[PDB]
Amino acid sequence: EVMLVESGGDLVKPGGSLKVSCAASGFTFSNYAMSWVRQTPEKRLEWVATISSGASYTHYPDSVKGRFTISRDNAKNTLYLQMSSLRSEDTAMYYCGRQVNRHDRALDAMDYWGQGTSVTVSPAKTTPPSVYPLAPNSMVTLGCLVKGYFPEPVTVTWNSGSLSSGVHTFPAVLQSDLYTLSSSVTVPSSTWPSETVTCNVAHPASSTKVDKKI
Amino acid sequence: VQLVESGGGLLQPGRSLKLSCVASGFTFNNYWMSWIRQAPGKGLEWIASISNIGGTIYYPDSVKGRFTISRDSAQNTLYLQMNSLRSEDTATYYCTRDLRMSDYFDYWGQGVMVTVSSAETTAPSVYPLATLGCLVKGYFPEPVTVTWNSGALSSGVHTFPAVLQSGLYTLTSSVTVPSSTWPSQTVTCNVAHPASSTKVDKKIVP
Amino acid sequence: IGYKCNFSNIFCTIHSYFIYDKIRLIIILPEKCFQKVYTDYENRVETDISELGLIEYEIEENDTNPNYNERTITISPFSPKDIEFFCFCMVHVRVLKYPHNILFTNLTNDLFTYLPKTYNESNFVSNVLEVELNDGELFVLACELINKKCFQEGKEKALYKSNKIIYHKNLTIFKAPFYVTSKDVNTECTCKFKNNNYKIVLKPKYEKKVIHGCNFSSNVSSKHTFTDSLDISLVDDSAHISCNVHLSEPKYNHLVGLNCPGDIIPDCFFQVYQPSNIVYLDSQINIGDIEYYEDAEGDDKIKLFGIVGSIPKTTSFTCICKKDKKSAYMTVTIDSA
Amino acid sequence: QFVLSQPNSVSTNLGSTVKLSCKRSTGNIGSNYVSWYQHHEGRSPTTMIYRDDQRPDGVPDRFSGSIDRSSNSALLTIDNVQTEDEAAYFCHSYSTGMYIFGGGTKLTVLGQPKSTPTLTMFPPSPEELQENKATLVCLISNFSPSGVTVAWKANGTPITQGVDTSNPTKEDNKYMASSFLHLTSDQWRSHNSFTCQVTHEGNTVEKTVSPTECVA
Amino acid sequence: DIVMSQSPSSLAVSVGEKVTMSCKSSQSLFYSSNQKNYLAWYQQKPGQSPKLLIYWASTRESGVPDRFTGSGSGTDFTLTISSVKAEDLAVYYCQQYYSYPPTFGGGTKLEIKRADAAPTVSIFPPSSEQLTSGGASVVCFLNNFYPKDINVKWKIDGSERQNGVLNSWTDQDSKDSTYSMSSTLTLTKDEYERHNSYTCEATHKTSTSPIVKSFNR
Ligand SMILES: *[C@@H]1O[C@H](CO)[C@@H](O[C@@H]2O[C@H](CO)[C@@H](O[C@@H]3O[C@H](CO)[C@@H](O)[C@H](O[C@H]4O[C@H](CO)[C@@H](O)[C@H](O)[C@@H]4O)[C@@H]3O)[C@H](O)[C@H]2NC(C)=O)[C@H](O)[C@H]1NC(C)=O
Ligand SMILES: *[C@@H]1O[C@H](CO)[C@@H](O[C@@H]2O[C@H](CO)[C@@H](O[C@@H]3O[C@H](CO)[C@@H](O)[C@H](O[C@H]4O[C@H](CO)[C@@H](O)[C@H](O)[C@@H]4O)[C@@H]3O)[C@H](O)[C@H]2NC(C)=O)[C@H](O)[C@H]1NC(C)=O
């Protein structure tokens, strides 16, 4: 399988710099050229940059010209992107996409897209979240609250990813320079409290990882 | 082995000359070459060095750009194109064959002389002095003739060397005569500059 | 100019990858050569040049000269097989195949069906084509230039230079240098076709800097990676240092050189010790197309060459790196098999 | 980068053992080959010593080299000094594109005996006085060897500028040289004491003149 | 640059029909010799990365459902789903690659008409470890209902209040095709320990009574 796994998401003060990688796996990396695209929080897509098959040619739009730097290491089969003099608008979800090479052209569609790693630009230093369980007799619903954290995003799972049927995770809302969200999982009433469900929270920017059960 | 040097002469500031150095005997493309010069009364100074073919070339910063070494395999000759000459370059230039492994010059060339002066060819001014001697002040180019009584005074002729005061030569020529011969007889100083075609005669009376 | 052999004014041995070169002969069996060929020398057969593996050829017979009836032939680099054709009077010719990839950009009316894969104007991006080139390769195109100023200049103030820019027929060709030093080099060919203007920009790939050589340099930040390194600033004054590369393969795509911080003796890589035994490299290897490149990292001295193809004799040569009284020997040993 | 310090002049007697130094300023001399060359006047320089101590075929054993790590200097040793050894000798060390040379010590062969210089003085001529100019003349003659040093003096004070001195040339069985001193018309009659002292190997012979001279 | 005007911005369809995605470029995208168009459509599933559908504005990718048949030439281009399914309710994006730089479209969300369903409200009290920090927040979990249009009112000891209340709306599901919503009654600890009855009422079209769930300390 084709697999583009990105990396390098964190918060930066306006003016800082950051490098994001993209470990390509499962194909002839030097045979196909690469590119980056970012999706603003408004779900608007922008073209970030694209690199040649052997890194001899690169292209950038007028917005991020001279500020960002795409690069690829065909020895380790990984793509890179060095961003500098960052602004608040540079906050987006940066995707690593491989261009089509059926017909040999420098500008083409993206055959396969990557998972995407999001960045954030703000002067508020990272504050870890506070995990508060939510306990409530048929088809019992289970809740998990995540309040007071910065910045987006935060990964949440139930029982290390074992429970997925009928599970909802509610979006994050902005709380006067902080964020807060919650999640709900529905289970058969016989399974609780006989068996244990554990909220699995993770905040990448501050390396936080809380496992509070209900 | 033999190194035939060519070129050299009188040149004024800014002019350019190319000195040639013909090789003989050895395999030319197998030995480094160099150019070494010596100014009058000064130590040996390195000027340029070239490799076997021309992969590495060094010059001292003194002649940076001003000089340009060269070598031709087909005709077995060495060259040194020098531009914008100055009074410091007034020296005799030698070409040498060097062994880069032993960092030394085994064979050397004749060495042709190079004169860099802005001097114009002018006649001298004679001054009688009282042993009696003449004074040849400010003459160029070398040399000047000095005789006593148009070659009648044989003994005592003691002409001193020349010296460069401010671009021009200057010398004196004394003759020790007996006490009884002067101020009795008429002592005549004949001076002539064949370069500028002059001939001044000065007597000595105090 | 091209190859020539004269029999009016011995053996005429020739073998190479022929890039539209003209083999000259001066005057013969079998029959009329360049259309008749002495393929199987032992069976003494007469195979015609039509039933051979070369794609495009051009055979010429000149009688206009009042002294000789000369015979010539042009060989296109398009050859899918290694063809060997003989003709004596002895003149044996084996046309070798070009090991490098060929990128044909046909922008002309003539349907060039000899080579299947080709590139045309659809691959352009707003009338711009950005071609990457490997260490050594060959780029071809077929169109008509505007004022015929193409494939020599460069706009990054760093001109991409080649071993040979050959202009025969209506085809512009670029022979990639086996190792170019600079980081950024480019060349623009502004060609016109169908009232459109096409610019073909060529640049080298990330060159694998795998120089099968020795780096005696006292520096770490080098733009060139040698397969063997060391410092020469530390040895005894009377300690001879021996870095001896040995290469043994059928084909060769190797880059051989050294980075000496001191002086290099002799003038390598043209001259080398056998082992004052200064011999010439091209004659010692006995291969025509050997590229030579040099570089200087400030005070470091880089000297290297590029061998591409078979090799006739097991050759050994030795260059010297001298920093003050210290010394460093290097022995290249290219095997023949 | 360093300087090769050679002395200025040495004089020997036929059959002596003479050592000639070449002191390197910075860096260990035992890492750069020194090469001793013999330059004779009116000829091309030859080669006597190379690679520290080995000498070319055609150089007698009299010539020898020696590297001293203590004093950081090479030494050219010439035993049994012969008549033709009167020439200038040079050293040369090379490193990384830098060909450094020495000072050039002039070796003198004393076949003639010691000799002090005979001086002779001359005041400016009347015709030069008309032109508002003056120039003094010091005549140094019949001296040998030529390890000499001049000094123009005026009323005891050493006059520095306006002086030109010729190097000892060969015109007699011994050397000869001359020196000059330019002056102003009023500046000559200004001071009433002018002297010319020649430092000849320690002997500072001296003569004098005065503006109060015999006239008419 | 190129502007990719793509309409409509919002779209709601039923299950098993045809819908015509529409997108128009500012400049033409049709080579003369190539005789093809340089437009690509992508499917960005909610909470997921986008993936390509059809290249050359007609040819489809391997693994792309045959129902997706794009069309158009020059400026206007239209994609069509022969039979809409409950698995592809994604924002479709219209991207050009005719000249630098490549720009995308505004996106066409695929909201869907669903058989009307009831909301499953569930109220939750604050945690004891949460009270230790000094805060107290109550959350009522509404989920799996149709449509999304709903309003949640928070009652505290009878009287209503609108001071500091969070509201989180989700996306449609792939299996049940419903929406969900949560709400947070942020309160201080001293304020929380005064009243004893806390209620949340939602107004859904299914019932005429405000669907209420409460707790008493
Ligand atoms: C560069 O040179 C290339 C090489 O010729 C050229 O591209 C080629 O163009 C020809 C056009 O004649 C193509 O030939 C086609 O081949 C297919 C199958 O191979 C045939 O089916 C085609 O014939 C159909 O169309 C004809 C009408 O022209 C009908 O008469 C016929 O009955 C068929 O219906 C056609 O012959 C060829 O495929 C390409 N490609 C290659 C690799 O040859 C190109 O035009 C030249 N110029 C430029 C600027 O690139
Ligand atoms: C240069 O290289 C390019 C790429 O190889 C090549 O482009 C080709 O352009 C031609 C037209 O110039 C296209 O050929 C066909 O044109 C006819 C015109 O009637 C259309 O009907 C074709 O569309 C059909 O194509 C399929 C096959 O019939 C059908 O399944 C489809 O549904 C359409 O009905 C088509 O446009 C052709 O598309 C491209 N090549 C490719 C591979 O797409 C060009 O010819 C080369 N030469 C030059 C001089 O540029």
Author numbering:
A (entry chain D): 1 to 136, 143 to 220
B (entry chain B): 2 to 131, 143 to 218
C (entry chain A): 43 to 51, 71 to 88, 99 to 160, 174 to 359, 367 to 428
D (entry chain C): 1 to 216
E (entry chain E): 1 to 217
Excerpt from the paper describing this PDB structure:
Three of these complexes generated crystals: full-length Pfs48/45 bound to 10D8; full-length Pfs48/45 bound to both 10D8 and 85RF45.1; and Pfs48/45-D2 + 3 bound to both 10D8 and 32F3. Datasets were collected to 4.2 Å, 3.72 Å and 3.69 Å, respectively. In each case, the resultant electron density maps were sufficiently detailed to allow us to build a model for the central domain of Pfs48/45. This domain contains the epitope for 10D8, also allowing us to build a model for the 10D8 Fab. The most complete electron density for this region of Pfs48/45 was obtained from crystals of full-length Pfs48/45 bound to 10D8. The AlphaFold2 model was therefore docked as single rigid body into this electron density and was rebuilt to fit the density. The N-terminus and loops 62–68 and 163–168 were unresolved. This model was then used to guide building of the observed portions of the N-terminal domain in full-length Pfs48/45 bound to 10D8 and 85RF45.1 (95 residues were built) and Pfs48/45-D2 + 3 bound to both 10D8 and 32F3 (20 residues were built). While 32F3 approaches from the side of the disc, 85RF45.1 binds on the more exposed, membrane-distal surface, allowing greater accessibility to its epitope in the context of the gametocyte surface. In this orientation, the epitope for 85RF45.1 will be most exposed on the membrane surface with the 32F3 epitope exposed to a lesser degree and the 10D8 epitope least accessible.
